[PDB]
Amino acid sequence: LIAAPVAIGGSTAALLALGRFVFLPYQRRRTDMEVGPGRLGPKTTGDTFFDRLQKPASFVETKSKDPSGFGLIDVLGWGALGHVFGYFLLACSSLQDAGIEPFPR
Amino acid sequence: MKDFTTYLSTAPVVGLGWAIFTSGLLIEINRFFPDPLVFSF
Amino acid sequence: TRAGNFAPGSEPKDYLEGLPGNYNFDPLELGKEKGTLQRYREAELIHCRWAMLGAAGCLAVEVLGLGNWYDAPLWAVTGDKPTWFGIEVPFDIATILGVEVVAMAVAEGLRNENQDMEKRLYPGGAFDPLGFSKDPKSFEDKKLKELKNGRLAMVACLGFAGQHAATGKPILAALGDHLSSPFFNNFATNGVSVPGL
Amino acid sequence: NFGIGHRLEAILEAHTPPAGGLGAGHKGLFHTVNNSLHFQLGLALASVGTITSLVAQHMYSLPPYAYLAVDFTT
Amino acid sequence: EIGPKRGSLVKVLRPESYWYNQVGKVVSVDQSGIRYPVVVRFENQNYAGVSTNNYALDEVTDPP
Amino acid sequence: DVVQAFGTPEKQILIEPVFAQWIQAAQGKSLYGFDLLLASSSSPAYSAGQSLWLPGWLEAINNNQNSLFLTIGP
Amino acid sequence: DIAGLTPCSESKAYNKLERKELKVLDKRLKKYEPGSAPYLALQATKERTENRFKTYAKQGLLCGNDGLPHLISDPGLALRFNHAGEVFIPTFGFLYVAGYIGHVGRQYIILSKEDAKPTDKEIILDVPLALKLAFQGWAWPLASIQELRNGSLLEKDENITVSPR
Amino acid sequence: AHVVKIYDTCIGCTQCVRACPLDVLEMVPWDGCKAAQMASSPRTEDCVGCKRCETACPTDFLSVRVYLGNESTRSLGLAY
Amino acid sequence: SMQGNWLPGSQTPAHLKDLKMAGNFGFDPLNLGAEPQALRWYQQAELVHSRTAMMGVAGILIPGIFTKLGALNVPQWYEAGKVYIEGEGAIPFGTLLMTTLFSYAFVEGKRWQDFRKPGSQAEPGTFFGLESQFKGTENGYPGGIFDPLGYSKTSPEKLDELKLKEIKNGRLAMVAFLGFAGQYGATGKGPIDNLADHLADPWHNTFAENGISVPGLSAVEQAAAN
Ligand code: CLA
Ligand code: CLA
Ligand code: CLA
Ligand SMILES: CC(/C=C/C=C(C)/C=C/[C@@]12O[C@]1(C)C[C@@H](O)CC2(C)C)=C\C=C\C=C(C)\C=C\C=C(C)\C=C\[C@@]12O[C@]1(C)C[C@@H](O)CC2(C)C
Ligand SMILES: CC1=C(/C=C/C(C)=C/C=C\C(C)=C/C=C/C=C(C)\C=C\C=C(C)\C=C\C2=C(C)CCCC2(C)C)C(C)(C)CCC1
């Protein structure tokens, strides 16, 4: 069945470690060619209340205290990936130990 | 005959001669041979 | 530096000049405008190595008589212990899946941040323990190599997959069949290789 | 507003095939779709009509409601 | 003098003209400095039924 | 229609829909006899999902009373 | 025996349709004397019906659940099974004549457009040149292929009337 | 009423003013054509949009253009 | 140059009046050879069709002649395929067809690359060093090991006389094989048996008496007999 705490924890630790030490240099390069200095950049320009909603948030650029660029939003996203992968593995184990074989024979 | 054969090279050479030839041709294939469905030579 | 011609008398294509393993291949002018040609080279130079590893694994499980390559990923089904080189592996299927999907992830991730084409193709340095790439003439000689045997490796992997797709037999047994009666045991005699036999 | 996500203009301008297969590709199409309300209306109506056709072709063969297949006229 | 030779075939590049990317024969080129001095004649009529039209100097080129 | 008018309905061109019948047999319809995947027990597509939804889908698609993938003629 | 269709020779509904046609044709035979021209015409019709039913059978023909012969359209399935004669060869048989007509029309169009006031040649046809092209169009695919290869088949858009969008 | 506009492609054949049975068009002196004439539409509000001037126009495309819209009691040809 | 005429009094095409060719008789009413490279490709196609027609027709005739003489029991060509298929020590049909297709694809790619680029098969160090003699003398006339008896490196007069003879026997063999196919299709017997029937009984054994060749002729003969 696989123990759900150890499976979820291992999956989210692996995903967070990947997102910090591995794909973080690959990340923000897509943003340099997406919303970079010479690219499209700002989504909106106007200065009314319905335009400040499209303006970027205030807690996403505060130079998070991690040595890398791993902010709170990246932590949430990679933890969501880890929870997704852990639940996928647990779901596959649940289908396996019920006597049902989804794989081709 | 020159004036007549200039007229005869207008619309009836393509509207009648081709029509009669292709028609009567196909009539005689459908007559001498019976109705086919499969091309088995 | 041209190795040869895939068709004797072909038109000389100028965008393939100087590349390692240079035949006058690519009829369809793929990667002619440079750019993706570098992507094509950096993708072929690792597809070759992966097919080399796979066909080496199949040949090692065959000629040492330790199993069949198609029957090798069958320990996950029916729940018996995995064996490598005869020795039983104490690991678990979930564990091996975890280490594989994180190890290949970190490998390709640190591979992806080279940011220079020459090291992306041929890293060297830490990827050169014995260091036979120091001599540039031997470097070009070994670059012409591993591509010929690499392309042959890719063709061999496709052949292994296709041979076990039609006839469910070990590849060594099929080789013995073609050695024994080649005119009776070939690709045209298995039935499902060409329609209409 | 957060730092992560995808930009539609970046995806549209990036998907330009090499060797001039589609010329400029989808370059300059984000402003064309956004500024023109009729483009969005036509796309929405195309998808809605196609999926209504899909709903019609999938309701009769796979009835999701109990005793719907018995009611022939319905 | 300032336009193509009289009687020479020219190609019309005017987009709104019926004879866009077509070949016409020059019949006269006006030398008084008017908006469309080049006068050409086409073997095929338009939908209005005319066969001649006037174009500027930049709207006519030699066909290949 | 003119062939049926002349009292000889066997002379009409009846092109059998081989493509869609082949597709239906690929989905598990055993009426046409094409022993393709999802209709043969040795195919990997039939084995994959053999215990998930295949006994329901095959039973529903091999029954001509329902409207699921009706038999189609010329 | 493909697509759940029985052969025409071993079909019960095919024979039922045949005997029904024979019965309705022999119904009209009782109202004429045997030595009459309508009787001879009806006998010829019955003989043609019997010949058609005989020739449609044992000719690689199948019919299913209706007694009416069916045609197999997918090539390959018409190759391994003896069904190419249904649509496979007659496809090229039609296409040869269609390319013949298109090629002789194209030849007449080019050979007329190079003539002074060429608009009259479409309403005033010439018979010797059209018949010469008519008996020169047997090798239409070779001529079309060589014209495509040398570029004279197509024309530069630069010289094609284009809508100004 | 409708909008009638004359472009510089006009060459002063002065037949668009004959084909208009409403005295919408007029011929003014010009210098951009050999005939030194140009169509002008002072009484544009009297036009109904019958496009007879466009029929009479020999230039390709049409030098005089009539655009429909904003119908009135005179542009609708109403005697009541 | 211009040798003979396929039809005396016919207007010979302008591309055949002053053209140096083997067996040029002015026979191109459809003007398929007006373009020069077109004529080169058609000449090569005629040469390969004619040469394989020599091989095929010789296989029809010489075993058939020896069977008529009683030397060998080799059957006629139309059932020889079934005879070998039903044999004991027989390579299967699929293997034979695929081997034939592979070898012919290889040699025809060689000939094709000779055609598009002349003498391009003589690229040094490409075919085991023996490709130095793979240079083509002319379209459809490669030479090299294809003339191992040295019967072509002489004066041009016997050379183009031999080319004319080759194209004549090749056209004859092509019409002969079309005849073999047709006279199996109609009579259902071997060509040697058909020749024996025509020699022993010419009037009652012909294409007209057989109803397959000209349908409706048998009905005409039966109506005229009654
Ligand atoms: C193995 C090599 C390879 C191959 C085969 C492809 C193949 C493709 N790439 Mg490409 N690509 C490659 C390598 C390759 N890529 C590499 C290495 C890179 C760099 C990383 C890219 C970067 C790249 C970009 C950036 C884009 C592509 C795109 C495409 C697609 C369209 C190509 C094109 O020009 O349109 C085909 C050429 C045409 C002229 C189009 C003609 C279409 C006709 C007119 C329509 C006919 C309609 C017809 C009536 C339909 C009938 C159907 C019936 C049911 C009615 C195509 C699937 C594009 C894509 O994603 O599109 C899917 C795209 O934007 N590629
Ligand atoms: C596009 C749709 C379509 C198609 C595919 C067909 C196809 C067919 N129909 Mg149908 N039909 C159609 C439309 C169509 N028809 C319409 C619109 C009508 C109403 C007017 C009919 C009415 C109709 C009737 C009433 C009958 C048919 C029949 C036929 C068959 C014709 C077979 C034949 O004559 O022998 C094959 C014919 C040929 C090979 C013709 C020869 C022409 C080629 C080019 C050879 C050239 C001749 C010659 C050798 C040239 C050289 C010499 C020359 C230079 C002088 C075939 C199954 C008949 C049949 O058999 O029923 C099954 C039949 O009884 N149809
Ligand atoms: C022989 C001359 C000729 C040729 C080569 C073509 C070729 C073409 N036409 Mg055109 N067409 C023609 C005559 C011709 N057409 C005539 C006379 C008409 C008026 C009825 C049309 C009406 C027409 C339409 C409305 C359309 C085409 C389309 C097409 C294309 C599809 C192929 C096809 O079969 O279309 C089908 C063609 C027809 C249904 C027309 C059949 C009319 C007969 C067969 C032509 C008779 C010409 C005559 C025999 C030539 C004289 C011979 C000479 C020896 C004296 C192709 C580019 C289609 C297209 O744009 O696709 C790209 C399309 O939508 N054509
Ligand atoms: C065939 C192939 C590539 C073919 C490419 C071709 C034809 C290219 C086509 C073109 O040239 C043309 C025609 C014409 C040109 O104009 C265009 C291009 C596009 C250039 C790659 C295979 C590539 C094959 C690869 C990478 C194989 C990898 C294998 C692995 C990893 C194996 C692992 C295992 O086998 C073990 C060891 C043991 C088992 O028990 C378990 C498993 C897991 C199965
Ligand atoms: C500070 C620090 C640290 C730590 C860290 C941490 C602790 C973090 C956090 C956290 C974590 C550790 C995690 C996170 C996560 C997040 C998120 C955000 C998640 C999410 C999830 C989800 C979203 C889910 C979903 C679902 C559901 C709901 C159900 C069903 C299934 C699914 C999956 C679908 C360390 C020591 C390392 C180092 C030093 C510093």
PDB file of C-alpha atoms in Angstrom, chain D residues 1 3 5 8 13 16 18 21 35 37 44-45 52 56 58 60 62 66 69-70:
ATOM      1  CA  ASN D   1       0.673  38.625 -10.053  1.00  0.00           C
ATOM      2  CA  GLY D   3       6.337  35.200 -10.301  1.00  0.00           C
ATOM      3  CA  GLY D   5       3.112  31.149 -14.735  1.00  0.00           C
ATOM      4  CA  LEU D   8       0.291  33.939 -23.780  1.00  0.00           C
ATOM      5  CA  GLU D  13       5.783  34.642 -30.372  1.00  0.00           C
ATOM      6  CA  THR D  16       7.542  30.229 -34.918  1.00  0.00           C
ATOM      7  CA  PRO D  18      12.334  27.396 -38.415  1.00  0.00           C
ATOM      8  CA  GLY D  21       7.365  27.085 -42.413  1.00  0.00           C
ATOM      9  CA  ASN D  35      -7.952  43.691 -29.367  1.00  0.00           C
ATOM     10  CA  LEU D  37     -13.599  40.927 -29.716  1.00  0.00           C
ATOM     11  CA  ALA D  44     -15.772  30.692 -28.540  1.00  0.00           C
ATOM     12  CA  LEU D  45     -18.682  30.003 -30.890  1.00  0.00           C
ATOM     13  CA  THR D  52     -22.507  20.816 -28.835  1.00  0.00           C
ATOM     14  CA  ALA D  56     -25.263  15.355 -29.413  1.00  0.00           C
ATOM     15  CA  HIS D  58     -22.269  11.261 -27.274  1.00  0.00           C
ATOM     16  CA  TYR D  60     -27.537   9.020 -27.614  1.00  0.00           C
ATOM     17  CA  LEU D  62     -23.833   6.827 -24.085  1.00  0.00           C
ATOM     18  CA  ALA D  66     -31.609   6.563 -16.103  1.00  0.00           C
ATOM     19  CA  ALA D  69     -32.675   5.282 -23.745  1.00  0.00           C
ATOM     20  CA  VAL D  70     -36.157   3.806 -23.239  1.00  0.00           C
TER      21      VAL D  70
END
